[PDB]
Amino acid sequence: PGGDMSEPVTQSTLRIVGAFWRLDASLAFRRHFPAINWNGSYSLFTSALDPWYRENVAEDYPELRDAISELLQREAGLQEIVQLVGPDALQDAERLVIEVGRIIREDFLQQNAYHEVDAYCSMKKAYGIMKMILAFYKEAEAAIKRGVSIDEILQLPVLERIGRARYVSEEEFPAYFEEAMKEIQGAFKALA
Amino acid sequence: PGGDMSEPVTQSTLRIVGAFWRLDASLAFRRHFPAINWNGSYSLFTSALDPWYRENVAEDYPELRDAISELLQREAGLQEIVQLVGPDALQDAERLVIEVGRIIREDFLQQNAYHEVDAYCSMKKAYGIMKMILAFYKEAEAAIKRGVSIDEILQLPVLERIGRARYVSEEEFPAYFEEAMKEIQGAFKALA
Amino acid sequence: PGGDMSEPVTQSTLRIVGAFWRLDASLAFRRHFPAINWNGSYSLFTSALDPWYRENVAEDYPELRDAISELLQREAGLQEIVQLVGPDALQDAERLVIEVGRIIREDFLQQNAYHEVDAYCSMKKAYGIMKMILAFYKEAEAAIKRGVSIDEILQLPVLERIGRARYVSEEEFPAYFEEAMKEIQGAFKALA
Amino acid sequence: VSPTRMNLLQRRGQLRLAQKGVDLLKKKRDALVAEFFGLVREAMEARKALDQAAKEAYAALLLAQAFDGPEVVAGAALGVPPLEGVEAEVENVWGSKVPRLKATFPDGALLSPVGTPAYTLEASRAFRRYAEALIRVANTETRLKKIGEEIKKTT
Amino acid sequence: MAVIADPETAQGFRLAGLEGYGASSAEEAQSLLETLVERGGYALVAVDEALLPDPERAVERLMRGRDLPVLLPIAGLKEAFQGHDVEGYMRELVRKTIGFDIKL
Amino acid sequence: DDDRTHPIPDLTGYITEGQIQLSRELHRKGIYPPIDPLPSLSRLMNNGVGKGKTREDHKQVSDQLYSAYANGVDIRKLVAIIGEDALTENDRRYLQFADAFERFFINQGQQNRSIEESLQIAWALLSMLPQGELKRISKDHIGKYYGQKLEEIWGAP
Amino acid sequence: DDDRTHPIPDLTGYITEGQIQLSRELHRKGIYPPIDPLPSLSRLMNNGVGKGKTREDHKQVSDQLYSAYANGVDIRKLVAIIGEDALTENDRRYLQFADAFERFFINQGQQNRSIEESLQIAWALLSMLPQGELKRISKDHIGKYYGQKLEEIWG
Known about the structure:
PDB class: motor protein
Order of helices and strands of chain F: HEHEHHHHH
Radius of gyration of chain D: 27 Å
Helix content of chain D: 55-70%
Strand content of chain D: 5-15%
Keywords: ATP synthase, V ATPase, V1 ATPase, motor protein
Order of helices and strands of chain D: HHEEH
Oligomer: part of a larger assembly
Organism of A, B, C: Thermus thermophilus HB8
Chains A, B, C: V-type ATP synthase alpha chain
Entry title: Cryo-EM structure of the V1 domain of V/A-ATPase in liposomes under pmf condition, state3N
């Protein structure tokens, strides 16, 4: 009724189901969809599908999934300090994590059910998007130790390439990914 | 019983009344009587009563009352500045409206029900008091725009004349108003 | 049921008993036994037993008990500010009260039922411990008034002497008390 | 938090404590603002004294450099040791420690202790007084900044 | 301690014992100031108004962890002789500290 | 449960004409009787005091004591943070007045005090504050009763 | 609803001789098994521990671990409000001990640790704290077991 998930029907349902997809009214008001609360949700079928994933998608897919989950957890942890001290007090390493978490939230989790292309997404397309995001994060992490300012990293034009990747069709996506990886590598090579 | 207006009887009364005179305990604690909270109170009969006011009291009554309401609104908007710094350390225009609001609050809204002459007040007396306050505010605004000191205006005995106006008897009030309405002009003309 | 003190059985019992020893779940969680909630407990037999304590224990024992209760009340009063602005914002004279309250809670009120010696405690041993704690508090306050910082007061080795007076045997306590009383006098004289 | 009457009473007690804390913090902020406005007047006075201390020392130095000779002043300046005894002591203000600046320069280390170039030696004295007036301005400003940031944090 | 100003008053301060630098442009002022910030030594620096308007605007990312050294603006030779009202500087300072900018 | 919103206290407030509330903090501090002045209220007090009954300075003295105690209990909590050295010259007067009030006017023990003795003690406590700062009391009573020291009653308080 | 005050766990706790309570917060961080030590309780612990049964230093080590973990958990709620940069060294030590405890003692995976290995890890974690702060442990056991390094167990 009121979003109160202590009501008897929800509590009786949670004792037998194997997956729990919790929705949030806070994300729905800001038009963030599918508005899945990734902190309260869980799935008990993840450990059994790993042999299927390791031969049907890629051998390193669970590692990338765990890395994405760890990045989301670190962003959620840093968001308390962000709103209790202000974004100016954070160090550049934490600013990079905050920005990468924002990029992940805007470009991978968000999906449009009415768009003619974004309504459907294959497993390999999501794998490519995760690879691009993790490669960008690794390059930006390497650039921090070299003394590159965080403002120089963020104003790079390769950020828009990652954001627009989910709108590419399935037939054109491998050509997009193959060029985008080299674009990321060259863009982080050309500085400092 | 709870103080707040969320009690069911108050909520049911809220939907079927045309006027609402909310009393506040903070004004009662400070011995400010009547304790009518002018921010939370409202009335829905003003527009229908406007034709009657302009024919029986004075032609300029509604606009002169709206000026008083606007002046009271302006004084409440500067309270967030007086919370940090003292009222004396402000701009001349900011000080003038605060002094005018204090004059209104302590000399026009306040009444004593146990007093012989402060328990009753007709419409003409209130209209004259408001006219005197408006004339004083306008002359003080002109003097501030000419760059006069604030303390040379607060020293004037006009403050006592307006302050004792509510205690003037009803039969003696026209002479008091006739004296004061030109005494204010004479006091302001004597200044530099 | 559920630890709710508004249970009708508890409410009916509250109106007929002379002593009420309320227990705390939070203190039992952190293994602080006997876990008696000092704020919620009371006793009505304190005034009637006072002539017996003067004859059988000590002449000034009720005064020491009242001083300890006053110190606990003062410590409880300051905890409303520690939760607000942190412990470091307090003055040194109040940090001394906080540390003395912590000392009393850790050393006097705590008792281990399964220990060989700490399972039983006579009245004179508790009186000696209370006298030691009050003497230490008075000497610490006198040192604070002379300009000594609180950090070097808390690091004195006599603190370990007080904290392990629980496990001293009953027959060995009259010598330990006299040694610690001389050490308390000696420690705060050479320091400043 | 499960719904019980005891939990409801605890929550209401927490609300009362929060309101009391808000009032206490408002009073503390008022005290800090009063101290800030007390300090700003001394800051202005120190700065306007530093202005005159700069002006008269500059005039004396210009006169000494003009009418004793630039060579004489340069030769006098060639035997002036640089300052090394700069001291930065610390003092507490509202739970924060701030540096206070002072120097321990010995006067007799300069060449020609007898002032044959009298105007040059007077200019040296004027510049020493100029530094001894500047340190007060520095201390007052470094106190004022910390008071301002404490007011910011309280707000 | 060191003062960066015109060469006439730089060596005039050196007559008292300070390390006076003769500079007239903001680029050399920024370079010398960052050299003094990165090195260990004195904790007080006086800068003329003709070189750097705000001392914090050059160490906004360098001195946030080590704010102990004092960077102070000072008046030049020409500015001191003609004089100015210091109330404008305090009016800027009160705005930079409490934000409201209204003061009397 | 020390709850003022319980039905038994709630329905009592609709019928009675005030309340006297005991304080647990004053009880734990050793004060008997632990009557708390600030939350207490008597509705019909104005009809029983004045001229021709008890004494004429009763109402103003009571109001001044209430206001001064309310100021002192508010200063006392800020003392714990900002310290006594940061206070003004009158905040230290109010802070001492609150302690003297709690130690003398309330903590009377098993004594039997007449109204004249209580008014004498109240005027002795009000003498600690500077003359003319008592805004709630007119100058006519101030010129008649102000000035007595508490040490004249401290011989046998 | 993760509710300990529900009638079924409440009536279960009054009959049984203890409980083992799992924590969802520890589960969300990948810790297995996610056993929460503070709500857990064993009523019959004192019968099966001590000299001649497991070792002479079992109960004191358990109590010291409980107190130190409670102190760290309490300090976490303080740094959630005032920030970690204003901490003293003791609060920082307790805060680091809590994280080391959660990362090493509770989190063990599928391995079968013996009692001696678990006591060795417990003494290694207690070595991070100052020796004088171990109030609940007798000095005889401290002189025998204190000083172990954690890097000699986990690399």
